[PDB]
Every structure is written in C-alpha cells, then in structure tokens.
Design an enzyme around this catalytic site. Sequence first.
Site, PDB file in Angstrom:
ATOM      1  N   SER A 104     -11.306  -1.123  -0.155  1.00 24.97           N
ATOM      2  CA  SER A 104      -9.994  -1.054   0.473  1.00 24.97           C
ATOM      3  C   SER A 104     -10.063  -1.276   1.981  1.00 24.97           C
ATOM      4  O   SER A 104      -9.085  -1.727   2.578  1.00 24.97           O
ATOM      5  CB  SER A 104      -9.368   0.314   0.195  1.00 24.97           C
ATOM      6  OG  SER A 104      -8.814   0.375  -1.108  1.00 24.97           O
ATOM      7  N   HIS A 152      -3.555   6.001   3.840  1.00 25.54           N
ATOM      8  CA  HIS A 152      -4.332   4.855   3.387  1.00 25.54           C
ATOM      9  C   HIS A 152      -3.719   3.549   3.887  1.00 25.54           C
ATOM     10  O   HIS A 152      -4.412   2.701   4.466  1.00 25.54           O
ATOM     11  CB  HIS A 152      -4.411   4.918   1.861  1.00 25.54           C
ATOM     12  CG  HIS A 152      -5.289   3.884   1.223  1.00 25.54           C
ATOM     13  ND1 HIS A 152      -4.838   2.629   0.866  1.00 25.54           N
ATOM     14  CD2 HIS A 152      -6.580   3.951   0.816  1.00 25.54           C
ATOM     15  CE1 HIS A 152      -5.820   1.962   0.286  1.00 25.54           C
ATOM     16  NE2 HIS A 152      -6.888   2.742   0.243  1.00 25.54           N
ATOM     17  N   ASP A 205       0.829  -1.202   0.000  1.00 22.89           N
ATOM     18  CA  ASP A 205       0.000   0.000   0.000  1.00 22.89           C
ATOM     19  C   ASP A 205       0.869   1.260   0.000  1.00 22.89           C
ATOM     20  O   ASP A 205       1.958   1.252  -0.578  1.00 22.89           O
ATOM     21  CB  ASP A 205      -0.961  -0.092   1.204  1.00 22.89           C
ATOM     22  CG  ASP A 205      -2.252   0.660   1.000  1.00 22.89           C
ATOM     23  OD1 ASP A 205      -2.200   1.893   0.828  1.00 22.89           O
ATOM     24  OD2 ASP A 205      -3.323   0.011   0.966  1.00 22.89           O
ATOM     25  N   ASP A 233     -27.267 -13.043   4.382  1.00 23.29           N
ATOM     26  CA  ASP A 233     -27.613 -11.924   5.250  1.00 23.29           C
ATOM     27  C   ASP A 233     -27.638 -10.590   4.519  1.00 23.29           C
ATOM     28  O   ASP A 233     -28.255  -9.638   5.014  1.00 23.29           O
ATOM     29  CB  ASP A 233     -26.610 -11.833   6.398  1.00 23.29           C
ATOM     30  CG  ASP A 233     -26.821 -12.909   7.425  1.00 23.29           C
ATOM     31  OD1 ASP A 233     -27.829 -13.632   7.307  1.00 23.29           O
ATOM     32  OD2 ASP A 233     -25.989 -13.032   8.341  1.00 23.29           O
TER      33      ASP A 233
HETATM   34  O1  LIG Z   1     -12.640   1.733  -8.100  1.00 25.06           O
HETATM   35  C1  LIG Z   1     -11.421   2.043  -8.103  1.00 25.06           C
HETATM   36  O2  LIG Z   1     -11.015   3.015  -7.409  1.00 25.06           O
HETATM   37  C2  LIG Z   1     -10.442   1.214  -8.930  1.00 25.06           C
HETATM   38  O3  LIG Z   1     -11.067   0.803 -10.113  1.00 25.06           O
HETATM   39  C3  LIG Z   1     -10.074  -0.004  -8.086  1.00 25.06           C
HETATM   40  C4  LIG Z   1     -10.035  -1.288  -8.623  1.00 25.06           C
HETATM   41  C5  LIG Z   1      -9.704  -2.374  -7.821  1.00 25.06           C
HETATM   42  C6  LIG Z   1      -9.414  -2.155  -6.480  1.00 25.06           C
HETATM   43  C7  LIG Z   1      -9.453  -0.869  -5.963  1.00 25.06           C
HETATM   44 CL1  LIG Z   1      -9.096  -0.561  -4.250  1.00 25.06          CL
HETATM   45  C8  LIG Z   1      -9.785   0.205  -6.757  1.00 25.06           C
END
Ligand SMILES: O=C(O)[C@H](O)c1cccc(Cl)c1
Length: 279
Positions: A224, A69, A39, A260
């Site tokens: 994330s 992050h 990260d 759920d």
């Molecule tokens: O949605 C987004 O920010 C990117 O497409 C993406 C794709 C895959 C994983 C993440 Cl954390 C973000």
Amino acid sequence: AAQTNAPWGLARISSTSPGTSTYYYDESAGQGSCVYVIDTGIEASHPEFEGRAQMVKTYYYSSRDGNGHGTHCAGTVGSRTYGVAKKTQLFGVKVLDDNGSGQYSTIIAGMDFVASDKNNRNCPKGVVASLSLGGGYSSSVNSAAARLQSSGVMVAVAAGNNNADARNYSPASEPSVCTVGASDRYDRRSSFSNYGSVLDIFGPGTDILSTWIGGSTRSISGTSMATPHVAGLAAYLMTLGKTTAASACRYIADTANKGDLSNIPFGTVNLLAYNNYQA
Ligand SMILES: O=C(O)[C@H](O)c1cccc(Cl)c1
C-alpha cells in the site's frame, strides 16, 4: 531541485544505488497532473497538502478519513515533504470505511466514478489513480480496473501483503494495470510483498514516513505504501511529457533500476522505480 534529508523512499527513486538521503527531482513536480487516491479518504486540511487536496466522493456517512491510511498514501503521492510529485492535484474517493474495510461493489463503483469524474476536472498533463487496496480474486474487480485504465487513467494497484503469488488477488492480478510490489531500504523485496509474473514494478514499501490524520505523521509498511510512489512518479513523468497514461507503466519499467533487488523469486521482475533525473 534537491530535497535534503528526505524519506528514504523518495531518495531511493532518484538514485541508482541505495543509502542516499537526497531526493533529486525536476521543479515541475507534477504540476498540471491529477491523482485520484481511492482509499479511506484524505485529510484535505493537512498543511502538508497546501490546499492541493480535495475530497470528491464518499460512499459512507462522512467524507473524512477516520483511519489515516488514505491520508498516508495521498501524502506519498503529493505532500510537500513526503510526496513524489509535490505540485500535483489530489482527489480523494472514500471507498473504504474507517476500519479499512469495504465491499467489492463499492470499490467497483468508485472506479467507475473516477472514469467519469475526470472529464469534469482540469488535468491538462494527465490523470492517475492510486489503489492501495485489494482482496481475493474477482473478475468483476479486475474488469473495473481495466475499464478505468482504458478510459485514459493510469491505474497503479498494490500487489498485496501475503508473501504469495499476486495472481490470486484483485485488482493486483489484472494484466492491464500497473501492479506494484514493495522493497526495503536495503534493496530487498519486503518480506510481506506479494510476487509473481503479474507484478510490473517495485517501489519503496517498508518503513515509509508520510502524513497521518490529526495533522500528524507516521511510518508504516506495505505494498500500500509502494503503490503511491509509482502513482506519483507517473504523474511526475506525465507532466514532463515523457509518457502518457496508456504507456506510463511500460515506460516506468523500461527506465527502472534493473537487477538491484534481492529476495526476488524466479518469474518476478527485478525492476525498481527510478525517475532518471539529471541535474
Ligand atoms: O494482503 C492483504 O492484506 C490483501 O490480500 C491485499 C491484497 C491486495 C492488495 C492489498 Cl493492499 C491487500
């Protein structure tokens, strides 16, 4: 052990129903396992890590988390107050710059690095990698994630935040790693969460309190944020001897809370991570 007035996501993964506020967990707490957080870096000096966090690699000028992050994600894995596996060892790999960006080549290098570096580390209970990042489809990125999984590391990756089918995103779309969608405290799919048949499991992803840089805390949302819940759960279950790196994603899906969640489109699993703790 029981953590009262816990962040909702920790409570959710130790309960069969939403709305509770206590995180129930076995005292072993992931001790003897290791989780690589790939990260923006980790603020290792944050008191919430109690010296269990270390930067091991950076692909930029500094190894410091200038974004927050990566520190936030590491905190959900294994900080004392905000973490799933409160005694695991945390290793930081900085593949994203302080703006949160990074090229695929650097992300691939970082994945190859973990596959080798883990052989240098004392992790008797197993190794996990948490990837709260991604982008558009890349077969090279998917291959690097498959290699990391093949090397004996449980790989958990974010599904993405486009309210779209995750098959068009990497490493989310790699079948052999564990792709994590996001849910909210009302047991809905988060409105931003990607979906699709490549998803393996959902975890809490909306309004997640965790550590932040400057020795602070803050609440933020995304797939994330769900991914480190699943990464920490794997470490926790591996320390308990319930599963191995090769099969932890399958075990987590087998023992999840089923049916759920709301707002789950046809074709997507209705499974929510669950630690099955019994006092
Ligand atoms: O949605 C987004 O920010 C990117 O497409 C993406 C794709 C895959 C994983 C993440 Cl954390 C973000």
